[PDB]
Structure 1
């Protein structure tokens, strides 16, 4: 076999590729305007989020059916193709297709299968393993942004980064597969009562799946609706652009770190209460920005918290889903669940911009984000796991 820490490395690789994909548009804003609108460019990012978040669902299903390796490597090919084709674009729709759909398609197919597979190697520590599958989305900015910046002084970014990302994803998918069906990597641990994981049709039909879905949409939407406004709130309060941006930049560090730390923490003490507390904290942050946000230090504290809570979602929801329905159907269960996040990624940033511009003030978007997080707090706290499924058909084998 292989040392079970390898899948952690693989998910790190794949998730880092996905982070580079989701971060690239920000480095591409100014070049594309110079040759030819920020909103026009941004529609490419929103299309990308939509396709990514939707394509996790087919990616999860196909991973569950025909294994995760084929899925991630196809995704690597699709992403490499789409990104690389963005270099040859000559119009806006060219970019919508190359980056928004092909690259988003490949990205979703890379993102999901490791998220499902890594915990299968770590039943003693499921949430930490998941965090390794999702931590790369924090890092992509750090490795790439400097490198992508180094290149333009822009098409070279698309082509060369597309190649490097394809290589990383193909390597990640090349070595990815669940443990052997029978023997689970361990060092430790009349007629019985045999339980079993949930089927995708059973999980999909469960009411708690959709409470979790709703909560996922709410939190995803809140964060995505206000994060882009953090620095503007600062500058609006009287800070220099340099100061405001410096402050908001701490968010990336917390968004990356929480993914591992929260995973480890709930592995140790359980999920529900920590998770609900994070949502509450996010709620309070949406409100508190109106008192802290006018100073580099205050604005930084809010950005760090917003980042901490936001990022935690992408470990804790898959971990929660794993607790409720088990790992055998996790490709399907969590892929369906992640589509909420695909939708929020599509609409949330736009809606936040619209509310601010509509009122000219930040009260509306931050208050709406606070309410969404409040509902999420409620759902996450109130929702306890369903009853473990009885496998009467294996139960009857005991004579």
Structure 2
């Protein structure tokens, strides 16, 4: 039937739509402050709500993708995202923005984000992590696509920022509907392959949800996610405090977007070839080291760039390697449910990480506390990821007894 790279393209399209949605808020920071008395933190509340709902809704999205297929889920998510984003276009108050952008749009976003992550590796049992990475790389590209577009619309005279919400929401709805229209697993039996009585079987959602290793991974995910989201917004400020100009610190920190994108594909290909656990643990350890190392390297464009690139590499890699690990532990059959539940950890980290980092800096007045806390979290994640080996593969005695 359909060439097994089409799923990768579809996940690229859907994840790009989600990256556009999650990047937009920064674009509207200044215009919304121009029209209303709206503070930066007041607008950032809409983003934090968006991350909360988006991360939470992967769980129901994964369950529904497993039960009734990923097409229905992704297309419904497209509808919800389009509705919420466009209604943000017609807003007049903060609560309206929280509802439209944070809740509705974030809801549709989780429903878009998860089903392709669960479907793509099924077409690539020889390259599961690379397939997953194609399902997530779009989150690193939404900036590069939307930034110029949203600036274009905001500054144009017949338009405004409301016009960004309206048009960009039609465009994102179309991309998500095109992604979800052609998305489905391969048929129940034959598996696309040129190459390939005890009888094992993948784990079930109730079985994985009850494994101690699933929650060790959940803890690692929460730690790594929280650490990144706690400091990334502080990189450029660390630079300016070290004596750099705003232009210079901004240039340096911008290399984070490139490594954040590239790692999603490259880390998948790497672990497809050499295995997950050791490289994964090494990434967390390096993330620990970078949280410490910024106090020695962050005072120059070259050092701050290195730290930013490294932080971006490790952070972005989490979103390919946690789904790949979950796929190795439990198999693809319940990957929708297993990984939907697991990603709720990111919903919570998205809600609280940035706020807590800001509070720690403002409480102390210095960057030592947030980066030291992020280093500790990344150290814990390092230990967890390094010590956690796959559970025993499951026996399917009900299939096994079919042999006379």
Residue 327 of structure 1: CA displacement? 0.1
Residue 141 of structure 1: CA displacement? 0.2
CA distance in structure 2 between the aligned counterparts of 1:87 and 1:53, rounded to whole angstroms: 23
Aligned to 1:175: 182
Matched, 1:390 2:392: no
Residue 209 of structure 1: CA displacement? 0.1
CA distance in structure 1 between the aligned counterparts of 2:218 and 2:124, rounded to whole angstroms: 25
Structure 2: unaligned runs, 5 residues or longer: 156-160
CA distance in structure 2 between the aligned counterparts of 1:93 and 1:265, rounded to whole angstroms: 44
CA distance in structure 1 between the aligned counterparts of 2:95 and 2:120, rounded to whole angstroms: 37
- TM-score, L = length of structure 1: 0.99
Residue 248 of structure 1: CA displacement? 0.2
CA distance in structure 2 between the aligned counterparts of 1:111 and 1:38, rounded to whole angstroms: 27
CA distance in structure 2 between the aligned counterparts of 1:300 and 1:181, rounded to whole angstroms: 48
- TM-score, L = length of structure 2: 0.98
Residue 32 of structure 1: CA displacement? 0.4
Aligned to 1:245: 250
Aligned to 2:297: 292
Partner SS state of residue 227, structure 2 = helix
Residue 363 of structure 1: CA displacement? 0.0
Residue 5 of structure 1: CA displacement? 0.1
Residue 123 of structure 1: CA displacement? 0.1
CA distance in structure 2 between the aligned counterparts of 1:131 and 1:110, rounded to whole angstroms: 15
Partner SS state of residue 254, structure 2 = helix
Over residues 260-318 of structure 1, what are the superposed CA-to-partner deviations in whole Å (9 max), with x where a residue is unaligned? Answer: 00000000000000000000000000000000000000000000000000000000000
Residue 201 of structure 1: CA displacement? 0.1
Residue 228 of structure 1: CA displacement? 0.1
Residue 162 of structure 1: CA displacement? 0.2
CA distance in structure 1 between the aligned counterparts of 2:154 and 2:236, rounded to whole angstroms: 25
CA distance in structure 2 between the aligned counterparts of 1:181 and 1:81, rounded to whole angstroms: 34
Aligned to 1:350: 355
CA distance in structure 2 between the aligned counterparts of 1:180 and 1:87, rounded to whole angstroms: 41
CA distance in structure 2 between the aligned counterparts of 1:242 and 1:157, rounded to whole angstroms: 26
CA distance in structure 2 between the aligned counterparts of 1:45 and 1:365, rounded to whole angstroms: 20
Q: Find the partner of 2:326 among 317, 321, 327.
A: 321
CA-based RMSD:
0.3
Partner SS state of residue 307, structure 1 = helix
Residue 371 of structure 1: CA displacement? 0.1
Residue 341 of structure 1: CA displacement? 0.4
Residue 71 of structure 1: CA displacement? 0.1
Q: Find the partner of 1:38 among 40, 55, 58.
A: 40
Residue 34 of structure 1: CA displacement? 0.4
Residue 43 of structure 1: CA displacement? 0.2
Residue 174 of structure 1: CA displacement? 0.1
Structure 1: unaligned runs, 5 residues or longer: none
Aligned to 1:27: 27
CA distance in structure 2 between the aligned counterparts of 1:353 and 1:148, rounded to whole angstroms: 27
Residue 335 of structure 1: CA displacement? 0.2
Aligned to 1:3: 3
- Runs of 4+ aligned residues of structure 1 deviating over 2 Å after TM superposition are none
Matched, 1:196 2:206: no
Residue 202 of structure 1: CA displacement? 0.1
Over residues 58-93 of structure 1, what are the superposed CA-to-partner deviations in whole Å (9 max), with x where a residue is unaligned? Answer: 000000000000000000000000000001111000
Over residues 161-214 of structure 1, what are the superposed CA-to-partner deviations in whole Å (9 max), with x where a residue is unaligned? Answer: 00000000000000000000101000112xx10000000000000000000000
Matched, 1:269 2:277: no
CA distance in structure 2 between the aligned counterparts of 1:188 and 1:271, rounded to whole angstroms: 22
Residue 344 of structure 1: CA displacement? 0.1
Q: Find the partner of 2:56 among 29, 54, 57.
A: 54
Partner SS state of residue 126, structure 2 = coil
Residue 354 of structure 1: CA displacement? 0.1
Q: How do 1:1-399 residues align onto structure 2 when only pairs under 5 Å count?
A: 1-36=1-36, 37-153=39-155, 154-189=161-196, 192-399=197-404
Residue 127 of structure 1: CA displacement? 0.0
Partner SS state of residue 187, structure 1 = coil
CA distance in structure 1 between the aligned counterparts of 2:162 and 2:190, rounded to whole angstroms: 48
Residue 13 of structure 1: CA displacement? 0.1
Over residues 21-62 of structure 1, what are the superposed CA-to-partner deviations in whole Å (9 max), with x where a residue is unaligned? Answer: 000000000000001100000000000000000000000000
Q: How many residues align?
A: 397
